């Protein structure tokens, strides 16, 4: 999710700004086949 939906659509930049907003975090991508946003 967070704009990680699989290879149909993996909008890395999506899921990096979502996390980016959270507090401590800096950045994000998809992860698992590009089902999973993980933030970083």
Known sequence: GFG???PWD???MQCHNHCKSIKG????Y???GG???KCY
């Open 10 to 12: 993996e909008d890395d």
């Open 25 to 28: 975090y800096k950045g994000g």
């Open 35 to 37: 089902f999973v946003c």
């Open 4 to 6: 990680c939906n699989g």
């Open 30 to 32: 998809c992860a698992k």
